[PDB]
Structures are given as C-alpha cells and as structure tokens.
Amino acid sequence: MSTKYKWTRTKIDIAEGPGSMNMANVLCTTGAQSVALVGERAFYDPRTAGSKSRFDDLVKIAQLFSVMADSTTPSENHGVDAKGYFKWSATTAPQSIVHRNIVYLRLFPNLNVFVNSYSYFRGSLVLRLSVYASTFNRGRLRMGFFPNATTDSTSTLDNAIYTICDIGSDNSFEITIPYSFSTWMRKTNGHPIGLFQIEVLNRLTYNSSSPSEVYCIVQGKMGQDARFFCPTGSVVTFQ
Amino acid sequence: MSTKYKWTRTKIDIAEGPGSMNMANVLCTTGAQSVALVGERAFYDPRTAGSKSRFDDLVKIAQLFSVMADSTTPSENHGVDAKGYFKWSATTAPQSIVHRNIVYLRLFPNLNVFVNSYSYFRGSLVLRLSVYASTFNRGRLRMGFFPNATTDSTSTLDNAIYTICDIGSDNSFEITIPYSFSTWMRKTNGHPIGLFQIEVLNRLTYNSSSPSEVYCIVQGKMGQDARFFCPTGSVVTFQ
Amino acid sequence: TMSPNELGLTSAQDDGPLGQEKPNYFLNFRSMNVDIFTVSHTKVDNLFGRAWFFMEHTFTNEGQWRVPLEFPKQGHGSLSLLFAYFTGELNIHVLFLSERGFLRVAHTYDTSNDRVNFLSSNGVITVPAGEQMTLSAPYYSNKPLRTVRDNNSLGYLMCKPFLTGTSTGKIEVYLSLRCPNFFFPLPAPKVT
Amino acid sequence: TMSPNELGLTSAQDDGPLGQEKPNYFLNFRSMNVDIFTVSHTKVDNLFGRAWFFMEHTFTNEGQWRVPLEFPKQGHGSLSLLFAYFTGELNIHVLFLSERGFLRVAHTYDTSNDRVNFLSSNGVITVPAGEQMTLSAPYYSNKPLRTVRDNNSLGYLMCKPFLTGTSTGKIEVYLSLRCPNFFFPLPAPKVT
Amino acid sequence: VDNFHSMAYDITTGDKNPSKLVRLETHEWTPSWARGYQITHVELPKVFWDHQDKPAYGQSRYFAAVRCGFHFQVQVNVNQGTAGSALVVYEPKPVV
RNA sequence: AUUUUU
RNA sequence: AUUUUU
RNA sequence: AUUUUU
RNA sequence: AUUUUU
C-alpha cells in the first residue's frame, strides 16, 4: 500500500502575477466570483421590453441606416460639403454637382459609435440616396464613388462605382462599396472610405404645379459582410 | 454518506517562489495569460508573403551559403588574410599559396548570427570555392583543411582533407569538414574550425584573349547534420 | 435570379418591420464574409465582457463610498447607449490602493440610502490592502429592466474601508458585465 | 550510386529554387545526425519561446509609458533579423518595481496615439506593486504581416502606473513570442 | 466572333496583353566596378508602367490597387574570352 | 494549427 | 441560458 | 443530513 | 499501516 510515503497535500507552483486582474479577456471576467446569496442566476423578462429575445450581436446595429453629417438646413454650398441633406435643383446644369465630399465612417451616427469603440473593421458599405420629389417631377442623377480617394474634386464618374437614379415611385436608390484596402482589416478611424459624388445627369423637370427643386437625404450602413475587430480607446465623448 | 465531515474547499501547499517568472522555458511562456478579448487565435496569411507555409526551423538558415570575411577588394596579401575574396593568378607558382587563414563560424554572415545566439553546436561544415574564369582558362587548384588547426602557416596538404579543382564548366568546387572535437558538442565561439589553405597545383593558363588571373569566392554553410544547442548571451550587436 | 429591388432600387417607406437583412449585388460583386479571428468581437457577451474604467475615490477616513453606477458615454462601453434596456450580471472591478487595511465592498439596486447604512447582506467582500478583486453582482433589481441611460442604470456600489492607523489612499474602480441582455435599440448618441 | 555532383563538383548558377538539401559525401564519410537533447533548440517556436530583455522605464508620476516594440538586434532574438515578415502571438513580460501601487498594462498595433489615451479595451491587466506578469498579446494588427525590422514591428506597449503616495520606481520590460510565423528570409545583418 | 479570323490571334490576346514580357531596363556594365557595386535597379512594380508605351500602362492607370507575380529574365552577354559574375537578386521593400 | 505535450 | 467552452 | 451542488 | 478518508 502507499503507506511507504507520508500522506501530504498537493504542492503546486504559482505562476507570475500574485493578484493580477485581467480586464481584457471575457473568459476571465465571466469566471469572477459571485456576491449572490447562492451564486445563482435570475430569470430575465423580455416581454416587458416588447421583445421575444435579447440582442446578441452589435454588428446588426452597424447595419442600420443613419444620415451622413445630418444638418437642420440643406447644403448652402451647392452640396460641396459633408451635409447628407441637400437640394436637387432644376437650375443645376446636366453635369454640375449636387453633392461632393470625402466619406468617413464617423460621418454616420450609428457607425461613428463603432468608430469610437473598435479600432479596425472590414466589409462593404451601403449608401442610400432618397430624393423626395412630387409625382410630376422627373429626371436622372448619377452618384458615383471612388474608393479610398482623397482629393475632394469633381471628376468624371465613368470609371467610378456609380448608380444612375431615374425618378419614379421608389425614389431611394442605393450604392454598395465592397471592402477595399491594402489590408485584410482597416482602421475604423484613419483613411477615408473614398470620394462620394452625386452629379446631375438630366435636369429635374417640373410643371406649373410642381416644385422646381427637391430635397435629398443620404444614409449609410454596413453590408451583410460587415465586421469590426479590435476595440480601442475613445476619440470622442458622447452625451 | 460523507456527511460525517463538514464539506470544505481543497487545501494545497504552494511551492517555492510566489510570483517567480520563468523566462527560460517555452513551455512556461506559451501558457501565459491572454489579453485577447476572448483569448483566441487569428488566421495567418502566408500568401501575402508569397509563401505556402511559415518557417519552422532555423537550422535551415544556418545551412545557407555566405561569403567568408567578404570584402570590397580582393586579398591584397596574396590571400594570406581572412578575405574569402581573392585572386587566382597565373604568376603564382605551382605550389605557392593563393589563400590561407584560420576559419571560425563568425567569419560567415549567416553563421555569425547563430554564433551570437547559441553557445554550442555540432555537425559538418561545407565550404564552396567559386573561381570565375573564362572558357579558355585552365588549371588545377588544391584546397585542403586541417581540422582544429591553429598555426596559420602554409603546410603540405597531403594529409589534410583536400579537394582538387580542375577548371571547366562547373567552376564551384566544395569541401566538407565532418564534426571534429573532443566533445559531443563544441563552442559556437571558441576554438577555430581549422586551417583553410588553397594552394596552386597547376598555374592558371591563358591565351591572347583570356585573363591571366581570375577572381575567387569562398562561401560557407552548415551540413545536413548541423545542430545548435544552447542559446547564450551576445558577443556583438547587429544593425 | 436577382430582382431590381436587390440591385439598389427600393423605397424607404417600405422598410418596416425593423431588421431586414436584404442582400445587395451588382455584376462582379457579392457579399463576401471573411473572418480573421476565431471569434466575433461584435457579440454583446464578448465586447462587454471586457471592463472599462469608471471612476476613482480618494479616502482618508473610514467613511463609506456610495456611487450610482451607470453605463459609460466614454469607453467602448458606449456601444450600450445604442440600447434602451438592460438586465443581467454585473462585473465590478475594484482596486484597493492602501498600505495597511481592508476594503468592504457591496452592491445593491435598492435606492434607499438606509438599507446600506449597515451592509448586513449587501455583499461585503473583503479586499486586503494593496489588493484588488472582481465581484459579480447579480441582477438583484426591483425593476425587471434597467433603462440603460439612468444616472443609476446600474445599481449603487458601496465601499467602507477598514483602516488601522493614519494610513490613507485611493480606490480606483472599473467595470464590465457578464452576459448582457439589451433590448429595443434607440437612436445613436450625439457628441459633446 | 553517388554522382559527381554530390561529391563537390557543382555550379553556383544552378542553385535555384532556394532550399536544396543536397547530400555531400566522400569515402569514409556520411551525414551523421546525432542528438544530445530530447528536442530541438533550433525550432522557431522553442528558441523564441524564451524571453529576452527589451528596455526599462523609471516612473515618478502616474504618467503613461508608450513604447514602439521591435525585434532585438541584441539578444538571441536577433535570429529574427534573418527574416522579413512576422505574425503571431506576442508574450510581454513586465516587472513592476514599486513599493505601493498598481500598474496598468496594455498593447495595440494601432499607430494612433489617441486610441490609447483611454485604455478602454486595450488590455489593462493589473500587476500589483512589487509584482510581475506575463501577458500574451494577440495579433490584433491591421496589417497581415509585420515587417520584422520596423521600429514598431511589434505593436506599442502602454504602462500607466496607479501610484498612491510619493512612491516612485522603475518598470523593467523583457519579452518573447508564442508560436511565431516568419517568412521570406533576408540576408544576414551587419555588425556595429 | 469573326468566324473568318481576319485577325489570327487568340481571342483573349487583348486581355493578357498587359502581362506580356517587356524590357524593364538596360544599363552598361562599366568595367572597373568593385564587388558589391550595384549595376542597375528597377522600381517594382511601378516599372511595368514605366512609360506610356508599356502594355500594362493602359489598365494600370484605372486602378489604385495591385497584386501580382513576376517572372524576370536578366540577360547579360559576354564573349568567351572575357569572364566575370553578377548577382541578380530580388529585394522586397524590407530589404530595399 | 499535434502552430502547448503524446 | 451551449446566456463560461465544444 | 441530497443538513455543499445535481 | 484502511497507522489521511470510505
């Protein structure tokens, strides 16, 4: 029998760090001690929230449209600013610009939050232009996008990813921008997404009882393949 | 039932060293805690490196040729220096020396790195002499090697490990030096590898349109049985 | 095949119900999902499973420290501001910076400031001087859901240090949550 | 039998592709592989699995310590200079030499110096005064590969000590890596 | 598709044209140049669009990103009477 | 990625 | 509530 | 004395 | 030496 050795408790070596508190790994925090009377769990009630289940993934929120650089007043510079709220006017030439600016994720309410949370990301971005005109107004508008472009200057969109918008019943055209960077993952706050330009293709037509100019709204969200990766510090403070 | 004893947590004895950090054993470091959000791993991309797999063993690098005591100018002392870059000249007598010196691992770029990393090693060493002459030049050259020799002096190579080089199409002759020491493992930086001598056997012949002297290059690498053992401190600082 | 709806032509007034994972394509393009890590960093459990600084308190006496715990409008935890209601475990990380003593720590969702005067059963864990602990407070709230914004969205934290001599110090506190249940996402926050 | 090629007679211009494990023989000789230890000390995982000093910082205030981590041109880690690209886990060993306090440690590959101003989710592990920890930072790089030479080949390390009184000290830092992926070996380095 | 092939070439000729082999550089090996001396270099990969007369110059102008493989052929001719040796090596940005 | 160990 | 991990 | 937990 | 516990 093992009576040739005096029974003793197990001896073990304690690794580096005496009471090192890991506040980075979730696998570490979830295992923390419980101040609960019996270390148990509670029964959650989604109904009171009108929901059938909790919200598990945040990416879905990043996939929700939000106005770009939204303002109370339309672009007062013929749309050459970041305001995603401008006017499509009959006067504007068949090639003049109705809106041009460099796009960044932070220009979007929902996205700007992730920008201040995660350090990197990847995936396609979707922009949806909604022109609110009357049933009589007609015309076309081509909106293109030069990925990672930085020179904020009007330029032919023949080689850019563009979408021609013909006014009808569904006046909310979109445009997708596939992930494009020299890396497998890009900074959530660094290099621009590209040059966004919406040029006039065909003057907005009208009649005696219809408006000679209409309002437009530009929204932005993440694609179904969107992802965010490293959480980083904050660059701004919300309220 | 075991209700004859009041249930309690396990008691264990903690070995010597409270937060002793072992920075010597890999089995210790690889088990360190992870600051990762979920303590996970990433998917590496070899393609961007043009490779199909990572590099696992360093010995293979030690098995890559590198010029010995490489210089911009050929040996100005008839090759009696460490320069692995000298000249084979027609004038040199049929027994005169074209190059002689004591060989050390540090005399090789690639190897010198391991010399500054590991403390010991073993295995055969291969030296490859490349004489760059024209298609008309002809002659023979015998290069020998006296293992662990220290007296830097010209001596008959009849008893040394030698290789006779007859100029032809493949003008890059080699020479292997089997592991030779009083130990199963020798200092990476200590006793010389031996005496390396390249004597003239037959005067370099030529003609009206061919050079009367050519350039030679001496490279060195480790054998397929090469091994390195203990990593030690550094004796030099790279850049 | 592909419909014109999935090619960009749609109507903003036909988006309800909320949550339409509609695919968008065009020639030479398709939603490509490529993963870099073995897991997601967007999942609520993972992201929030990582703590973030909250506040610091400098003590001199053995007084008590009562503080309304709330969600951050500052760190990566701000992503919570996108929601309206919360419920679940709460991980509190406390650092007791003191030469010689002990720190009593407790947590409750009870608003009454008298049920805390004693600390009887409010979770009085003990962190010896110069130490730090991570206590996970259960959802002992009297309200099924915690509006995520409230200055007291999270329950109050108590800290009554038991000092021995003239020794004084400071208690830095940071926190995270274990498995969080968020509901009814609201509009994105503004910046200061 | 043995060809003249394997007897020393070869041509340097016929070595490509790179990596030719050609055997070399002569009478009374053959490649003899004899092992002294149960395992290899040449394997990248093993060699680099052992740390090496990096640098030391002497703190006086609660300021932060930002430092571009890079491969050594000094210790056995120099063997890395033989490669061009790296990728994989990074083991950071930090020693907090202080009388009374705490040391916040974090790591990121992000070049921006503002994403670190807070330390929200950059891995703020806590080493109590007079203690030492070994944190393994994942490859949270925005670049698939890390040129091995860059003054910031390895991501930046952050150290914001949380002191309590006039106490001051120094933070010595050394490091190693877990399973390293090196690619495209370049020419050997020069000496100073 | 012209069934008569009035143009006898592969249908994908124009497509592959930019990958065509081209002369990237031609410098003269000036005698009396010590070992290690750099004979000539070549800006990779922008050299394939070195001049507007490069097959790849056309397309290269409409795209900002590139991912490609190379196949070099350094040629050096010298009469039999003469001798010498040159080191043709590829140096990634890290090395350069 | 038996890229902790067999 | 595979609401620690598979 | 499932008078640690199932 | 069920001379740790059953």
Side-chain angles (χ1 to χ4, degrees), chain A residues 2-3 5 7-75 77-172 174-180 182-231 233-239, chain B residues 2-3 5 7-75 77-172 174-180 182-231 233-239, chain C residues 1-29 31-60 63-96 98 101-130 132-139 141-159 161 163-169 171 173 175-192, chain D residues 1-29 31-60 63-96 98 101-130 132-139 141-159 161 163-169 171 173 175-192, chain E residues 1-29 31-34 36-40 42-96:
Chain A
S2 291
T3 66
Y5 299 112
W7 170 266
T8 60
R9 295 184 292 288
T10 299
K11 185 181 297 180
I12 294 178
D13 292 65
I14 167 181
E16 325 105 359
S20 302
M21 183 176 286
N22 184 304
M23 302 172 80
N25 194 307
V26 58
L27 301 173
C28 169
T29 61
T30 60
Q33 293 187 57
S34 175
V35 298
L37 183 59
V38 194
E40 296 166 27
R41 190 179 298 172
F43 297 118
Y44 307 115
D45 176 43
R47 279 227 186 72
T48 297
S51 180
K52 296 182 178 180
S53 61
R54 65 163 182 174
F55 215 61
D56 62 303
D57 205 307
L58 301 175
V59 67
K60 299 181 180 180
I61 296 299
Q63 303 177 301
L64 298 182
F65 280 119
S66 53
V67 183
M68 173 187 86
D70 185 303
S71 179
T72 303
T73 62
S75 178
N77 301 63
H78 301 300
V80 302
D81 46 51
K83 289 185 177 181
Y85 174 48
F86 53 80
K87 293 185 298 181
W88 186 173
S89 181
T91 60
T92 307
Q95 265 301 64
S96 296
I97 181 59
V98 72
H99 174 287
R100 179 195 62 186
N101 82 308
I102 303 301
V103 182
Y104 299 73
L105 291 177
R106 61 170 178 291
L107 292 176
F108 300 100
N110 297 307
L111 302 180
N112 182 54
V113 182
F114 292 65
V115 180
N116 195 62
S117 297
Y118 295 70
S119 183
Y120 315 120
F121 80 106
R122 69 164 297 94
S124 60
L125 293 63
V126 181
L127 303 178
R128 189 173 66 181
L129 172 61
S130 298
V131 56
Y132 298 109
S134 67
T135 62
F136 304 139
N137 299 302
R138 294 302 176 67
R140 290 169 179 290
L141 205 63
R142 181 172 71 170
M143 72 170 112
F145 192 74
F146 276 120
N148 302 63
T150 62
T151 301
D152 188 303
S153 300
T154 304
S155 51
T156 305
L157 303 66
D158 284 309
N159 184 58
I161 307 176
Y162 67 71
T163 301
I164 301 178
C165 309
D166 178 53
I167 294 181
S169 59
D170 309 305
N171 299 304
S172 60
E174 300 181 301
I175 180 176
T176 304
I177 300 72
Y179 182 63
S180 54
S182 59
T183 54
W184 60 348
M185 181 196 295
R186 66 180 302 176
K187 257 182 171 58
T188 312
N189 177 57
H191 187 67
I193 300 298
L195 175 60
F196 184 53
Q197 182 180 304
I198 302 178
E199 62 181 2
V200 172
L201 210 177
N202 283 170
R203 276 200 175 72
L204 188 167
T205 56
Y206 59 75
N207 58 53
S208 301
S209 46
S210 56
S212 62
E213 61 174 57
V214 300
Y215 293 108
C216 308
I217 295 297
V218 179
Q219 296 180 298
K221 69 172 185 178
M222 295 304 287
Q224 295 298 297
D225 52 53
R227 302 179 184 298
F228 287 77
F229 295 110
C230 304
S234 300
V235 302
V236 65
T237 305
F238 302 120
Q239 57 185 183
Chain B
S2 291
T3 66
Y5 299 112
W7 170 266
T8 60
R9 295 184 292 288
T10 299
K11 185 181 297 180
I12 294 178
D13 292 65
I14 167 181
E16 325 105 359
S20 301
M21 183 177 286
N22 184 304
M23 302 172 80
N25 194 307
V26 58
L27 301 173
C28 169
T29 61
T30 60
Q33 293 187 57
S34 175
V35 298
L37 183 59
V38 194
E40 296 166 27
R41 190 179 298 172
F43 297 118
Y44 307 115
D45 176 43
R47 279 227 186 72
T48 297
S51 180
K52 296 182 178 180
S53 61
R54 65 163 182 174
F55 215 61
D56 62 303
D57 205 307
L58 301 175
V59 67
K60 299 181 180 180
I61 296 299
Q63 303 177 301
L64 298 182
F65 280 119
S66 53
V67 183
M68 173 187 86
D70 185 303
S71 179
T72 303
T73 62
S75 178
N77 301 63
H78 301 300
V80 302
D81 46 51
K83 289 185 177 181
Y85 174 48
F86 53 80
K87 293 185 298 181
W88 186 173
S89 181
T91 60
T92 307
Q95 265 301 64
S96 296
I97 181 59
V98 72
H99 174 287
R100 179 195 62 186
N101 82 308
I102 303 301
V103 182
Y104 299 73
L105 291 177
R106 61 170 178 291
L107 292 176
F108 300 100
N110 297 307
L111 302 180
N112 182 54
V113 182
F114 292 65
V115 180
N116 195 62
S117 297
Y118 295 70
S119 183
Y120 315 120
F121 80 106
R122 69 164 297 94
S124 60
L125 293 63
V126 181
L127 303 178
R128 189 173 66 181
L129 172 61
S130 298
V131 56
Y132 298 109
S134 67
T135 62
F136 304 139
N137 299 302
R138 294 302 176 67
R140 290 170 179 290
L141 205 63
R142 181 172 71 170
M143 72 170 112
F145 192 74
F146 276 120
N148 302 63
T150 62
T151 301
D152 188 303
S153 300
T154 304
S155 51
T156 305
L157 303 66
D158 284 309
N159 184 58
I161 307 176
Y162 67 71
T163 301
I164 301 178
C165 309
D166 178 53
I167 294 181
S169 59
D170 309 305
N171 299 304
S172 60
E174 300 181 301
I175 180 176
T176 304
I177 300 72
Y179 182 63
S180 54
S182 59
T183 54
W184 60 348
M185 181 196 295
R186 66 180 302 176
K187 257 182 171 58
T188 312
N189 177 57
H191 187 67
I193 300 298
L195 175 60
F196 184 53
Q197 182 180 304
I198 302 178
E199 62 181 2
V200 172
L201 210 177
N202 283 170
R203 276 200 175 72
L204 188 167
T205 56
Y206 59 75
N207 58 53
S208 301
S209 46
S210 56
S212 62
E213 61 174 57
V214 300
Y215 293 108
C216 308
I217 295 298
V218 179
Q219 296 180 298
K221 69 172 185 178
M222 295 304 287
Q224 295 298 297
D225 52 53
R227 302 179 184 298
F228 287 77
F229 295 110
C230 304
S234 300
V235 302
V236 65
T237 305
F238 302 120
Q239 57 185 183
Chain C
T1 56
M2 295 311 306
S3 61
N5 185 305
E6 300 167 296
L7 287 177
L9 194 292
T10 57
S11 184
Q13 61 175 58
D14 301 304
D15 291 339
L18 286 60
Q20 297 186 301
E21 307 184 325
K22 186 206 68 176
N24 292 300
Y25 311 122
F26 57 100
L27 185 52
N28 192 40
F29 176 65
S31 181
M32 289 179 260
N33 300 61
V34 305
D35 298 298
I36 300 177
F37 304 119
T38 54
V39 315
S40 185
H41 298 191
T42 59
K43 291 183 175 299
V44 297
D45 298 308
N46 299 305
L47 175 93
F48 297 111
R50 183 198 296 274
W52 64 78
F53 183 66
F54 180 104
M55 190 174 274
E56 172 178 294
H57 177 58
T58 59
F59 61 104
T60 173
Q64 196 175 66
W65 189 212
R66 185 179 181 64
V67 291
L69 300 182
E70 55 190 59
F71 291 69
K73 303 175 177 297
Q74 178 61 61
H76 64 300
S78 298
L79 294 174
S80 62
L81 305 181
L82 294 178
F83 295 112
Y85 302 120
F86 163 69
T87 177
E89 282 78 53
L90 169 59
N91 292 175
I92 303 177
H93 313 284
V94 185
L95 283 62
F96 186 42
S98 64
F102 278 106
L103 182 61
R104 314 161 203 161
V105 185
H107 174 77
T108 58
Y109 287 105
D110 186 301
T111 60
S112 304
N113 292 182
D114 55 304
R115 309 308 289 284
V116 62
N117 272 318
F118 188 68
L119 288 163
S120 70
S121 172
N122 302 284
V124 287
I125 299 182
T126 57
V127 186
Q132 66 188 310
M133 182 66 246
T134 293
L135 52 78
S136 182
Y139 195 56
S141 177
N142 61 300
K143 308 185 68 176
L145 299 174
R146 304 298 293 186
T147 310
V148 44
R149 297 248 192 179
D150 286 46
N151 295 303
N152 61 64
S153 54
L154 300 171
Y156 312 65
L157 176 155
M158 312 311 302
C159 289
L163 297 65
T164 173
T166 180
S167 63
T168 65
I171 306 173
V173 180
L175 49 65
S176 65
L177 42 78
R178 170 161 165 62
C179 274
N181 294 53
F182 288 110
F183 310 80
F184 210 75
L186 51 73
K190 291 184 175 181
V191 296
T192 56
Chain D
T1 56
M2 294 311 306
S3 61
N5 185 305
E6 300 167 296
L7 287 177
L9 194 292
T10 57
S11 184
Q13 61 175 58
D14 301 304
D15 291 339
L18 286 60
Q20 297 186 301
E21 307 184 325
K22 186 206 68 176
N24 292 300
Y25 311 122
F26 57 100
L27 185 52
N28 192 40
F29 176 65
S31 181
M32 289 179 260
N33 300 61
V34 305
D35 298 298
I36 300 177
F37 304 119
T38 54
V39 315
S40 185
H41 298 191
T42 59
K43 291 183 175 299
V44 297
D45 298 308
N46 299 305
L47 175 93
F48 297 111
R50 183 198 296 274
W52 64 78
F53 183 66
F54 180 104
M55 190 174 274
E56 172 178 294
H57 177 58
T58 59
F59 61 104
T60 173
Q64 196 175 66
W65 189 212
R66 185 179 181 64
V67 291
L69 300 182
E70 55 190 59
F71 291 69
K73 303 175 177 297
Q74 178 61 61
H76 64 300
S78 298
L79 294 174
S80 62
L81 305 181
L82 294 178
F83 295 112
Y85 302 120
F86 163 69
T87 177
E89 282 78 53
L90 169 59
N91 292 175
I92 303 177
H93 313 284
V94 185
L95 283 62
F96 186 42
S98 64
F102 278 106
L103 182 61
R104 314 161 203 161
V105 185
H107 174 77
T108 58
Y109 287 105
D110 186 301
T111 60
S112 304
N113 292 182
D114 55 304
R115 309 308 289 284
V116 62
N117 272 318
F118 188 68
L119 288 163
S120 70
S121 172
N122 302 284
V124 287
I125 299 182
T126 57
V127 186
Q132 66 188 310
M133 182 66 246
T134 293
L135 52 78
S136 182
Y139 195 56
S141 177
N142 61 300
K143 308 185 68 176
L145 299 174
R146 304 298 293 186
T147 310
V148 44
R149 297 248 192 179
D150 286 46
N151 295 303
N152 61 64
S153 54
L154 300 171
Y156 312 64
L157 176 155
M158 312 311 302
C159 289
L163 297 65
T164 173
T166 180
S167 63
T168 65
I171 306 173
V173 180
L175 49 65
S176 65
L177 42 78
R178 170 161 165 62
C179 274
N181 294 53
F182 288 110
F183 310 80
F184 210 75
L186 51 73
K190 291 184 175 181
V191 296
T192 56
Chain E
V1 59
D2 177 49
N3 52 59
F4 280 116
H5 307 302
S6 55
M7 278 296 169
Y9 286 118
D10 193 300
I11 185 61
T12 61
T13 294
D15 306 61
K16 291 172 167 294
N17 186 58
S19 66
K20 174 184 179 180
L21 174 62
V22 297
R23 189 177 70 69
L24 305 178
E25 170 66 305
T26 300
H27 193 63
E28 185 162 297
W29 209 123
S32 77
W33 268 346
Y37 177 83
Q38 185 176 301
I39 299 296
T40 183
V42 63
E43 299 302 299
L44 212 60
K46 64 179 181 181
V47 64
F48 284 62
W49 323 309
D50 207 64
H51 296 302
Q52 48 65 63
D53 63 60
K54 291 298 181 62
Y57 173 101
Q59 287 297 68
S60 66
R61 294 302 183 177
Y62 298 114
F63 295 107
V66 183
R67 171 120 170 176
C68 58
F70 299 108
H71 173 54
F72 303 115
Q73 299 187 304
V74 180
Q75 300 165 174
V76 185
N77 299 292
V78 58
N79 57 293
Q80 301 199 188
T82 309
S85 64
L87 170 60
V88 179
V89 61
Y90 165 58
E91 292 172 49
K93 186 178 181 181
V95 179
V96 183

